[PDB]
């Protein structure tokens, strides 16, 4: 907590200029949006991922404007479920897959953070979501047991863009960028939440000592 | 309408590989249009119908079919389709009707694809139409900007929202040097749902109705 304020505030010290800012989803960004009040003139143009942060930001009196009307984002930060030692993750794991995934590709600069619980040395124990259209949900299931992936359907779950979520356990993702090249080519998969073709450009880890090392 | 002659032969004739009990995926546009009416004295060989669109469920149905869940259907044994481009190799670009998503969704979980066209599809070099992509609306921007380094000219298609509630980009003035590359290009762009090309899986069989109102298989 104490620790989450520390990241985040090592974070927001990343908005020195004027910029359109990208928002992500999640606990630790919770933090980061409260001390965004000491960056009020630097911050041009708001862009969120999810619900919940946008929520927050206006109750803070930030305008949040839709990715269309601000175009490119200077800066997104935002948190992952796990981080390997190439700066590659898996997100996606609650709100806002999709959406996370388009603002960190609109994004000039990624800063992720994350605690170091979160940090591995090969990405797959955390299940890896992908987000289907839902008349392909049996067919992609099938083509995801083909590349050795246990894929369970997340059950009472329906995206912003109106489609499924699978998470897929058992993998271990030895190449991120040529796993999540080839979930793409599948079809009927939207979106998957390895972040890897573009990964974080910064990573903030809160430490099991409870400091901030930037990586 | 000599044109429409030339849909109705190649819809017909597709219509001849229906010679067992099977699983039936049908396709979305005008040349599909007189194969939905052919299907009606194929009726007790189609257990089971999936379809690609609501537009072709709405004939489907007028026609008394009933259309299934391709999640409860499984694999559909033979897909029949249009296509608004084909080149010499059976790939082809697809999606002037905004339905390539579950088209290709279905192409994907086929046996066996048919491709009915009149000859003024059929081309030398696939870029001669505009090449439809889907993408996630909140991305529209990025991918147009993404389109444009690409080498394409990106157009809103407007008033259109898919069966999926995506909308369309239509890409002009983009050459297709290598198709199976291109298509993986493009599915490589955060936000796109999928693209027109269907060549990392080709159509298997193309029936082509040319002028003198003959056929032609590929
Ligand atoms: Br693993
Ligand atoms: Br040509
Ligand atoms: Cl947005
Ligand atoms: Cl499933
Ligand atoms: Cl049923
Ligand atoms: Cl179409
Ligand atoms: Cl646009
Ligand atoms: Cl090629």
Redesign the interface.
Known sequence: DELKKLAATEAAKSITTEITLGVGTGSTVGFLIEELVNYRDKIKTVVSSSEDSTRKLKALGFDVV???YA??IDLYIDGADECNNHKELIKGGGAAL??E??C???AKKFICIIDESKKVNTLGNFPLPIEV???????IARQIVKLGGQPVYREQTITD???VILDVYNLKIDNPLKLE?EL??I??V??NGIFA??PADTVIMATKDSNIVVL
């Open positions: 839709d990715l269309n175009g490119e999709t959406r995934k388009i960190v590709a609109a259209i839902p008349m392909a949900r049996s067919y863009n109106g489609n090249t793409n080519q079809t009927g939207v979106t073709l573009k």
